[PDB]
Amino acid sequence: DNLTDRLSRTLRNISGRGRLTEDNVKDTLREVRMALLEADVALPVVREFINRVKEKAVGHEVNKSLTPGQEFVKIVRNELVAAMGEENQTLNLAAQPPAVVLMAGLQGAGKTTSVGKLGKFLREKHKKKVLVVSADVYRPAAIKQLETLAEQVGVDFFPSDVGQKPVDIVNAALKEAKLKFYDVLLVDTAGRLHVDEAMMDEIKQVHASINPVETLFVVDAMTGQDAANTAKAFNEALPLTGVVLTKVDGDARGGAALSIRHITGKPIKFLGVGEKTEALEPFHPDRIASRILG
Ligand SMILES: Nc1nc2c(ncn2[C@@H]2O[C@H](COP(=O)(O)OP(=O)(O)O)[C@@H](OP(=O)(O)OP(=O)(O)O)[C@H]2O)c(=O)[nH]1
Ligand SMILES: [Mg+2]
């Protein structure tokens, strides 16, 4: 990423210094603010991050250590993690089976792909008997896409077709999920390229009839700051439990990851890091912060 190089260079010079002047701390923070802003991180997030470092990096606290540069570096890390999220947020599949995970996103965010990815993760790493279904009757080849995905990853597919109504489709799928003791039902959805009441009304009807335990917004990382604004929109119309940030491999900037948790107020739970089925990665903020700073 270009954020990783910029921050790592700015921090590296400070680490060696055995004492940091207040001007030295202020100058380094201005360079950090520019790097995050250049990475499409939202100003509300950058502003709060810089203020939190400044308060904790007062020279008295930083200069007390024998490695003041090191102490400053590791404040920046701690506050980056705080912005990206709280520890690891997982899906609650511990409630009454079947566990319904309803997935939303605008078209091309990668929700259908992510449906597959998640089903492989739940069966392989959690030994969950999984069933998936598609309420995207607007594109026919889409339903097939899920079907093909479901066999590559080894979950079960509940069939649907163009003529039928999304509410009827998920009601059938839950009924069936109960009858064969499935652990989770993942429910794919249609996307409209914009968060419009047309899209929200359909999701909220599905959502209402099927009481999902997790509502996951799939958002595309290479839309940068829009990802947070798009998810803040869906969240305002129908509350989210988690976000899946897809196409992280190609962004090369970041910012959606730093921005989503604080703009939306809900966590990034998963992270799409490849076109392949294996490329789903639970979101651990500590690991991401470490990579950004080296
Ligand atoms: N690099 C990368 N790509 C991802 C990731 N997740 C999804 N994609 C890509 O997103 C594209 C759209 O996926 P869909 O699953 O159809 O998205 P949708 O359900 O929201 O409509 C796919 O591209 P496609 O159909 O192969 O081509 P195109 O649609 O991009 O033209 C897929 O390969 C990811 O984590 N990393
Ligand atoms: Mg689709």
Author numbering: 3 to 296
Paper quotes:
The stringent response enables bacteria to respond to nutrient limitation and other stress conditions through production of the nucleotide-based second messengers ppGpp and pppGpp, collectively known as (p)ppGpp. Here, we report that (p)ppGpp inhibits the signal recognition particle (SRP)-dependent protein targeting pathway, which is essential for membrane protein biogenesis and protein secretion. More specifically, (p)ppGpp binds to the SRP GTPases Ffh and FtsY, and inhibits the formation of the SRP receptor-targeting complex, which is central for the coordinated binding of the translating ribosome to the SecYEG translocon. Briefly, SRP recognizes hydrophobic signal sequences in the context of translating ribosomes, and SRP bound to ribosome-nascent chain complexes (RNCs) in turn interacts in a GTP-dependent manner with its receptor FtsY, also a GTPase, which localizes at the cytoplasmic membrane periphery of bacteria via a membrane-targeting sequence.
Determination of the dissociation constants (KD) of (Ec)Ffh-NG revealed an affinity of 7.9 ± 1.9 µM for ppGpp-binding while its counterpart GDP exhibited an affinity of 2.2 ± 0.6 µM. For the NG domain of the SRP-receptor (Ec)FtsY a KD of 21.7 ± 5.4 µM for ppGpp and 9.8 ± 1.1 µM for GDP were obtained. These KD values show that ppGpp exhibits similar binding affinities as its GDP counterpart for the SRP-GTPases Ffh and FtsY. We determined the crystal structures of the pppGpp-bound NG domains of (Ec)Ffh and (Ec)FtsY at resolutions of 2.5 and 2.4 Å, respectively, as well as the crystal structures of (Bs)Ffh and (Ec)Ffh in complex with ppGpp and Mg2+ at resolutions of 2.5 and 2.8 Å, respectively. The ppGpp or pppGpp molecules are bound to the G domains of Ffh and FtsY and occupy the canonical guanosine nucleotide-binding site. In detail, the guanine moiety of (p)ppGpp is recognized by the well-described aspartate of the G4 element responsible for the discrimination of guanosine nucleotides by P-loop type GTPases. The α-, β-, and γ-phosphates of (p)ppGpp are coordinated by the G1-element (P-loop), and by residues originating from the switch I and II regions including the G2 and G3 elements, respectively. The δ- and ε-phosphate, which are covalently bound to the 3′-OH group of the ribose moiety and discriminate (p)ppGpp from its GDP/GTP counterparts, point away from the active sites of both GTPases. Both phosphates are not coordinated or form any obvious contacts to the GTPases of Ffh and FtsY. The missing coordination leads to a high flexibility of the δ- and ε-phosphate, as observed in the crystals of (Ec)Ffh with pppGpp. We conclude that ppGpp and pppGpp interact with the SRP-GTPases Ffh and FtsY in the same way as its counterparts GDP and GTP, respectively, also providing the structural explanation for their comparable KD values (see above).
